[PDB]
Amino acid sequence: LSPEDKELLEYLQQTKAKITVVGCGGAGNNTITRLKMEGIEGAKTVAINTDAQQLIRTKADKKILIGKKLTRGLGAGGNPKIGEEAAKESAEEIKAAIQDSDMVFITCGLGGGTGTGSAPVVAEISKKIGALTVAVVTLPFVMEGKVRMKNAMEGLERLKQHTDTLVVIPNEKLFEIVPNMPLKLAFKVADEVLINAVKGLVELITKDGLINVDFADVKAVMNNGGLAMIGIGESDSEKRAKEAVSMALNSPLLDVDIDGATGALIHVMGPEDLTLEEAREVVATVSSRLDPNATIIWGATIDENLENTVRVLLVITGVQSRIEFTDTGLKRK
Template identity: 45%
Template sequence: MAIKLITNNVDGAKIRIVGVGGGGGNIINNMVDAGINSVEFIAINTDKQVLDLNKANVKILIGKDVTKGLGAGMDAEKGMKAAENSRDEIHRALEGSDMVFITAGMGKGTGTGAAPVVARIAKSLDALVVALVTKPFGFEGNMKASIANDGIEKLKREVDSLIVIPNQKLIEITDDPNITKNEAFALVDRVLYHATKGISQIITEPGEMNVDMADVRTTMRGMGDALIGTGIASGPDRAEKATLAALNNPLLENIKIKGAKRVLTNISTNNSMKLHEFEKINSMIIAEVGIENESGFIIGTIDDPSMKEDELMITIIATGFDNEETNFGNHTQTKSEGKGIVELAAGKTKLKSNNVNPKREVALYDDEDEQNVQKYKIHEIPNDQDLKNLDVPAFKRRGDDLNLNEDFSENLKPIEEFDDNEWDDFNIDEDFQKPAFLRRQMD
C-alpha cells in the first residue's frame, strides 16, 4: 500500500476546544493544566459559580433568563433552552473556527442538553466539529445513563465525528482495585486529553511528514462514529509497544478497528524517529485495519521537544465504519446470526443459552457501560409452517428437551414419614377445605 505523505505546513488553523457543562468544564481545566499548544479554550455553563472558577480563555454563561445562573440540574431540556437562549453569544465565540472540539460529560442537564446546540452552531460556521463525550460510571445510576444515551443520539446528528468514552470501561481496565472516585475521573480526563492533544498536534505542529487540516477533514467530516487510540512507550521496542497500546486502547475495546475506511495516524517523538520504526508502525496498522484503498490511510510525524528523549507517542483516528455489523472484540456478529441470547455487560459478550431455535434472530445492542445486564427480546414473525403446527405443544415446537414420562417418585417423601413438627410447619386449618373464592369473600 502506498502511504500518503503530506509536505504542506498548516498556517493559522484555528482550533477551539469547548467544554460544555460541569463535566466539560473539568476536562477543560485539566487540559489547560497539562497544556495543548495553539488552541483556544471555551467554557460554557449554566452555573455561574462553577464557571467563574474555570481556567478557559473564554467563558460563556448561558441561559441567564432560564436558569438564573444556578445550573440545569439533570434537566437536559433546560440545558438545551439555555443554549438556544444564548445562541448569538456562542456564535460570536466560535466565528472563524476551522475545527471545534466539544467535550462534555453526558447525563446531566447542561452538557447533555446544550452540547448538540453548540455543535449545530459550529457546523453552521463550516467548522469541522468533533465531539468527545463521556457516559456515566455505573455507580452514577440508571437515570443518568438514560439521559446520557438520549443526549448522545441527539449530539450524533449534529457533529461530523463522535467519540464516546464509557467511563465504566476505563475503570474496569485499571489494575488498582482501591482506586478512588476522584482518581477514576482523573483517568477519564487524561484519556480525553491525549485524544484531543493527538488530533490538535496533527494539525498545528510541524513535522517531517506533516498532515494538514484538509487531511483531518477528509478523515472526520461527516463520518459519524469515530474511534481514537493513543499509545506511549519508550525503550528499544517502543514502536511496537506504542502501536499495540493504541490499537488496544480502552477507546477501541470491543469494537475492532478492522474495516475502517479511513485512518489517520500521527507519530510524535523528541526528534528521535527511526526509519525502521516508521516502517514497523505502518505495517502493523495496515495489517490490523486491512485498508484496501490507499487513499484511506494517512500518516504523519511530529517532533515534540516536550517529550522525553526515548519516548514515542502514536495517535490513531479511525472512521467510516460499516454500520451493518456490530463488532465485539475479536468476534463480529451480524444481526442475522442467531447464536443464542447474548448478554452485554460493559461491552462484553456472554452466551446465555445455546438451545435457541437457529431461525430466530438475535438483536444486539451495545449498551457499553450499563451497570446492570440487560437481556433483549427475541421476536419471531410466524410463517405458514408455524401456523400449521399450532396443535403441537409449544415446548416441542421450541425443541426443548422435556420428558413428560420421567419418574419423579424417587424424590417424593412418603406422607407417613413426616413427623409432628414438620406438620406443624404447614399450619393447615379447616378453612383450606373451603373453595378459594369463598375464603376470599369471608376475609
Template identity: 45%
Template sequence: MFEIIDQSPQEAVIKVIGVGGCGGNAVEHMIGKGLAGVEFIAANTDAQALKRSTARTQLQLGTNLTRGLGAGARPEIGRDAAMEDRDRIAESIDGADMVFITAGMGGGTGTGAAPVVAQVAKDHGILSVAVVTRPFKFEGKRQKVAQAGIDELAKIVDSLIIIPNDKLMQVLGEEVSVLDAYAAANEVLHSAVAGIAEVINYPGLVNVDFADVRTVMSEVGMAMMGSATAGGADRARQAAERAVASPLLEEVNLAGARGVLVNITASAGLKMKEYHEVMNTIKAFTAEDAMVIVGTVIDDAMEDRLRVTMVATGLGGAGAKLRAPRLEIVEQVFERTGTDGMGGSEAVDYDRKRDEAAAVAAGRCATIAAFPRGSMATLRLSDTARKA
C-alpha cells in the same frame, strides 16, 4: 505589474468548549497540562462554577432562564438555556476550523446544551468532535437521560467519543481514587486534542495539514482515534499497538478502516525500519484500498521515545467485536506532546500505581482483549459527515 507577497501558512484554529460541570472540569485539566495552540471555552448555567474557570472565554448560559443557578439536572432547561444564548455560542467558536465539545451526559447542562453547541458548529461549517462521559449503569434514570443526549449528539457532530464510567473501575481497578479515575477520563480528551493539534500545526519531514484531517474524517461510518508513546528498542511496535486500542472507551469493530491518518513523532534518530513497523502494525486493521495519510514530526525533545497518533475512519458496524491476541501493557506513558507548554503537572502513571493482581481481578485484561490494542479513542461519524 504583480507584487509577490511572502505569506506564512495559516495554522488551523482549534477550540475546545467544555459544557456543564463535567465539561468544565475536563477543560481545566487540559489548561493545567499546559496545552498550547488551542483556545478554551467554558459554558455553564451555573455562575459559581464559571467563576472558578480559568478558560479564556466563559459563557454563562440562560441567565434569564436559570438566573445562574444551574439546570437542576433537567436537560430541557440546559437546551433552552443554550438556545437563549445561541448567538453568543456562535460568536465564541467563530473562526474555528475544528471544535472539540466535551460534556458529561446524564446531567442538565451538559446533556441539553451540548447538542445545541454542536448544531451551531455544524451550521457554521466547523468540523466537530464531541467527547462525552456515560454515567455508571447503577445510576438508572441518569443512564437513560445520558443515552438520549448521546443519540442527539450523534445526529449532529462529525465524530463522537464516549467514555463509559463503568470502564473506569474495570480498567483502573476498584481501589483507584475518584480523583485519579476522572483524571484518566480527562486524559483521553487531552490526548485526542493534543494529538490532533500536533498533527495539524507542527510541520514535519512528511507534513499533514488540516485538509488531510478533513479528508480522513469524511469517510462515513464508525471511527476511532488514539495516541501512545513508548521507549526502548521495541518502541515503534509498542507505540503503534497501544495507539490502536483504549480500554477506557466503548467497544467497536476495528476491521476494515477505509481512511487512516497517522502521525509519528520522534527525535532525529528515527529509523526507516521503525517507520515501517508503525505502518505495518496499523495497516493490519485497515482495508486494502484504504486512504492512508502519514506525517512525520522530528522533535528532539522526545529523546529516545516515539509517539504514534492515529485517526481511523470508515470502519465496519458495531456488531461483531474484533478479537485480538491478549495485550499486556507493561508501562502506560502519558507524554507531554510537542503542543504542550512548560507549565502543568506530570500525568499520573495509572498502570504503575495499580496493583497488578487487583487489576486482573477487576477484569482489566479481559477488557483490553476486547480491543485490538493500545491507547485508542472511539469515534462515531454522522451519516452526513462533511466532505473536504
C-alpha cells in the same frame, strides 16, 4: 516578494486553520482548563456552562455563562433539557465565540444536564457557520447509575445528528486498563484520557512534527467520519513504537471491530530520538488491520515531557455500523 507572491501571501493571510475547542459542563470545563494551562497549540479555548461557580474557577480564552434567564447561574441538576434550552438561549453568544472557526472540537462528559443538552446545540451552530464539527465525549461509568447512562446515550443520539465525526470514549472501559484503580481516582484517569484524546487530535493538526499533516486531508477524513473511537498506547521498551501501537490497537477504549473502519487518524508522539521510521512502523501496523480502502492520516511530533517513552493515539472512524446505541451504553454488533 513579487506581484504573484505578494498576492498569494495576502491570500494565506485571510485563509487559515482557525481551530476552536469548546468544553461544555463541568467535565468539559475541567478539560478546557487543563488544555489552557498546559497550553494547547494553535487552538482557541472556550468554556461554557450554566453553573457560574464552575465557570469562574475554569480557565479559558473565553467563557460563556449560558442559560442566565433559565438557570440563574445554577447548574442544570442533571436535566439535559435545561442544558439544551440554556444553550438555545445563548445561541448568539456561542455563535460569536466560534465564528470564523475552520474546525470546532466539542468536548464534554455526557450524562449530566448541561454537557449532554448543550453539546448538540453547539454542534449545530458549529455546522451552520460552516466549520468541520468534531466532538470528543465520554460515556459515564456504570457506577453512576442507569439514569446517567440513559441521558448520555440519548444525548449521544442527538449529537450524532450535528457532527461530522463523533469520538466516543466509554469511561467504564477505563477499569479494564487499570483493574486495581482506586475509585477516588476514576475521574482523574478519565481526565487524562480525555486530555490526551483532544490535545492529541488537535496538535496532530497544529503541531509541527517530523512530517506534515495536511489540513485538507484531515477534512476529507473527518468530514464524514461518523462515529469514532480511540486507542492509546505507550512503551519505552526495545520495540517501543511496536509495543505502543500494539497497545493502542488492543486498547479497551477501542471496543469494536476495526476491520470495517473507513479511516483513521494516527498521532505518534515521542522524545527527541523519535524517528520517522518508528512512525511508519506504527502506520504500517494499523494499515493492515483496516480495510485496504481506508484513508489514514498520520503525524509524528516531539514531546519533551516524554523522556524515552513513545505514545500512540489512534482514532478509528466510520465504525457506527459495528455499533448499536442502547440505554446501557454502546454495544458491539
